[PDB]
């Protein structure tokens, strides 16, 4: 049924068919992230851990449609509460495991956050969100194992929010990337 690509190039450039258009079908193109399994042969290049924080590392610019990055989570490592965009995110497993937690949108009001969702991203699996779906934040399970995923965002974007968990307070951020196609950069 699903299109199984083989190696991560195959998916690449099924990815660049998936977004040529004007329409995307979310759950076609889950399935088919999701299908592939991962091969640290073919993404090695990219994975390029940092000691304190999480790393974020470009793969393919999709002609403009999307940002194709691999994000290296080392012990212990995670995110902080944020938002997407109005972007479709898919973000796939490629090694370890990540807790992932819902948010709900926080008021005008200063207030404890709300958690909708908090489950764990299995081998290869492929999650999705956007903005109407919630806000998240992702976790390495492992506090002596790392953590890969590979993670698709349509349109691009370069700043998000953070939230503050105890108030809802959001702060801009500007994302910044660790390496480029496998290159390190400034
Ligand atoms: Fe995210």
């Known amino acids: 049924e699903v299109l199984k690509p083989r190696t991560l190039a195959d998916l690449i450039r099924i990815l660049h068919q998936l977004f040529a258009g004007d329409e995307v079908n979310v ?3 889950q399935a088919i992230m999701e299908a592939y399994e991962s091969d640290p042969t073919e993404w090695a290049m990219y994975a390029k851990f940092d000691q304190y ?5 470009l793969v393919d610019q999709g002609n403009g449609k999307f940002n194709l990055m691999i994000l290296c989570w080392g012990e212990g490592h995670g995110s902080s509460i944020h938002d997407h965009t109005n972007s479709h995110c898919f973000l796939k497993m490629l090694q ?13 009001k200063s207030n404890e956050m709300v958690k909708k969702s908090e489950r764990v991203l299995r081998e290869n699996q492929c999650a999705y969100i ?3 779906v919630g806000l998240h934040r992702v976790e390495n399970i492992s506090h002596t194992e790392p953590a890969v995923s590979l993670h698709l965002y349509s349109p691009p974007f370069d700043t998000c929010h953070a ?4 108030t809802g307070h959001k702060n801009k951020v500007t994302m910044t990337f660790h ?3 496998g290159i390190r950069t400034p």
């Open 27 to 29: 759950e076609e193109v």
């Open 53 to 57: 924080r999480y790393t974020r590392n």
């Open 96 to 108: 370890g495991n990540l807790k992932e937690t819902l948010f709900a949108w926080p008021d005008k």
């Open 130 to 132: 956007n903005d109407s």
């Open 163 to 166: 939230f503050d968990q105890r």
């Open 179 to 181: 390496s480029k196609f």
